[PDB]
Design a protein around this ligand. Structure first.
Ligand SMILES: Cc1cc(Nc2cc(N3CCN(C)CC3)nc(Sc3ccc(NC(=O)C4CC4)cc3)n2)[nH]n1
Ligand SMILES: [Cl-]
Length: 263
C-alpha cells in the first residue's frame, strides 16, 4: 500500500496557492512533471509522530481505494509535512452549490457518481466506511465529474451529516448506514443548493428533534424534471430513515441513481 507512494521535497513544488479553509490545502505546480497537484499541510506549529502516522494512514487508505470516483494520492511531503494528491480544477461541491443554479442533468450525474464512489468503498474486503461525506469533501474535475476525498476520519457544521443513532447512543460502532445517512443530506444539498439547517439558531434543539425523526424541509417538485426529482426526493427520504436497517444499501442506491441519468 505505502510502497508505491513517493516522498516529495518542497523544491519540487512551486506557485503555492491556497484553496481550503482543518489544514490548509494548496494548488502546487510540480516543475519537473509540468502538472498541478494538491497538497494538504498540517494545521499545527509542531507536527509530532501521531500526525505523521495519521497522515500516512490517510494516504494508504486512499491508495487502497484507487478508483475512477475516488481522489488519487501520490505521496507525502516532509519539508512542510503534507499529503500530496491529484488537483481537481473545479473544486468542492459546496462551492459549486453556492455559485449558480445547476442544470438538473448535472445534479443527477453528481449524485450518481458520488453514489458509485461510495458503493466502491463499501464493496472493498473489508468495507471502507467514509464517515465524513459532505459537499466540502466531494471534488469535481474540469468537466464536473466527481471524485470523493477526505479519508482522514475513515475506518463544527458537520452536525447535519451525523446520523441520529450517533446522537442516541454514546459510542455506537460505525457502519455502512452512517455513510448512507450522510449521502441523504448530500442529496438534499444537490436538490436545494442550500446548506442544511442554515437558518436555525438552536443547534441542540434540532439535534434532539432529529433523534425523534426531524429532517431538512422537503423541497418542492422541480419544473424541468418533475419525475426524476420526485424519485430522488423519495430515495433521499429512505436514506435518512431513523431506523438504520431500513435505509438502502449503496448497491440498491446506485441502481436507482443510474436510472435518473438515463435519457
Ligand atoms: C485535496 C484536493 C483539493 C483539490 N482542489 C480544490 C480546488 C478548489 N478550487 C478550484 C478553483 N476555484 C477558483 C477555487 C476553488 N477548491 C478546493 S476546496 C477543497 C480542499 C480540500 C479538500 N479535501 C481535502 O482536504 C483532502 C485531504 C483530504 C476538498 C476540497 N479544492 N484537489 N485535491
Ligand atoms: Cl423528469
Amino acid at each position: 500500500a505505502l510502497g508505491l507512494l513517493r516522498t516529495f521535497d518542497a523544491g519540487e513544488f512551486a506557485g503555492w496557492e491556497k484553496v481550503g479553509s482543518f489544514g490548509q490545502v494548496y494548488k502546487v505546480r510540480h516543475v519537473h512533471w509540468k502538472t498541478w497537484l494538491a497538497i494538504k499541510c498540517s494545521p499545527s506549529l509542531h507536527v509530532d509522530d501521531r500526525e505523521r502516522m495519521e497522515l500516512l494512514e490517510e494516504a494508504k487508505k486512499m491508495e487502497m481505494a484507487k478508483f475512477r470516483y475516488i481522489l488519487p494520492v501520490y505521496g507525502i511531503c516532509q519539508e512542510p509535512v503534507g499529503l500530496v494528491m491529484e488537483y481537481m480544477e473545479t473544486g468542492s461541491l459546496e462551492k459549486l452549490l453556492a455559485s449558480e443554479p445547476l442544470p438538473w442533468d448535472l445534479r443527477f450525474r453528481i449524485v450518481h457518481e458520488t453514489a458509485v464512489g461510495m458503493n466502491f468503498l463499501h464493496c472493498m474486503s473489508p468495507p471502507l466506511l467514509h464517515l465524513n461525506l459532505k459537499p466540502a469533501n466531494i471534488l469535481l474535475d474540469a468537466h464536473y465529474h466527481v471524485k470523493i476525498s477526505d479519508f482522514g476520519l475513515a475506518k463544527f457544521g458537520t452536525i447535519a451529516y451525523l446520523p441520529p443513532e450517533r446522537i442516541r447512543e454514546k459510542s455506537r460502532l460505525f457502519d455502512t448506514k452512517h455513510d448512507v445517512y450522510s449521502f441523504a443530506i448530500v442529496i438534499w444539498g444537490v436538490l436545494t443548493q442550500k446548506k442544511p439547517f442554515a437558518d436555525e439558531k438552536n443547534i441542540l434543539h434540532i439535534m434532539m428533534k432529529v433523534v425523534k425523526g426531524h429532517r431538512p424541509e422537503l423541497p418542492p417538485i422541480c419544473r424541468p424534471r418533475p419525475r426524476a426529482c420526485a424519485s430522488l426526493i423519495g430515495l433521499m427520504q429512505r436514506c435518512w430513515h431513523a431506523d438504520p436497517q431500513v435505509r438502502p444499501t449503496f448497491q440498491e442506491i446506485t441502481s436507482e441513481t443510474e436510472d435518473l441519468c438515463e435519457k
